[PDB]
Amino acid sequence: KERQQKAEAELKELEQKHTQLCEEKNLLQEKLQAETELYAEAEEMRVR
Amino acid sequence: KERQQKAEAELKELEQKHTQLCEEKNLLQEKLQAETELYAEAEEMRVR
């Protein structure tokens, strides 16, 4: 039972880093969008 | 045996998730540095 308790604790750690994965995916979408927007604005400003 | 191999699979998942988190953080820092430098140069040339 202590062995399955350790396994369940690792499972809670898995859930916590699953939430971390979701946060990091949202962060990745946001940062990629920001980079693309700034690159487009950069193209327009170098045309200017 | 089943519990320990399941725990090892969970540990591999933990390592993969943490590696993905670290890689996305590195992408974050490099592209944010790029964003800051682009903003600075854009404002400089814009006022010019």
Side-chain angles (χ1 to χ4, degrees):
Chain A
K1 293 179 179 179
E2 199 57 39
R3 297 297 318 119
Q4 292 85 19
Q5 174 48 237
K6 176 54 160 74
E8 299 304 316
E10 304 173 53
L11 285 156
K12 293 179 179 179
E13 285 164 346
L14 276 176
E15 307 153 356
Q16 301 315 308
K17 52 187 59 61
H18 277 105
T19 69
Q20 298 312 311
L21 289 176
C22 302
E23 299 327 295
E24 206 58 26
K25 293 179 179 179
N26 304 133
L27 193 64
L28 201 60
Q29 305 140 19
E30 174 268 342
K31 66 173 72 71
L32 288 154
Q33 283 173 340
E35 206 65 23
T36 49
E37 294 145 22
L38 185 45
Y39 282 156
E41 295 139 14
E43 162 70 33
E44 173 182 2
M45 61 79 71
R46 295 176 64 186
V47 176
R48 288 147 36 74
Chain B
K1 183 76 174 64
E2 286 177 303
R3 295 292 183 184
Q4 186 173 355
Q5 59 84 31
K6 183 178 179 180
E8 293 321 302
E10 302 170 44
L11 180 59
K12 302 149 198 145
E13 279 188 336
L14 313 165
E15 185 64 34
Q16 186 39 246
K17 294 166 174 125
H18 274 315
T19 308
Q20 179 55 254
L21 183 65
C22 185
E23 288 146 341
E24 277 168 284
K25 196 63 59 67
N26 309 141
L27 187 64
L28 186 152
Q29 186 173 355
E30 62 86 20
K31 91 174 49 178
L32 260 54
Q33 181 263 328
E35 270 158 12
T36 54
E37 67 195 2
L38 262 69
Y39 282 149
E41 68 201 69
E43 299 305 320
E44 179 181 359
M45 61 79 71
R46 190 171 186 177
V47 75
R48 288 174 176 269

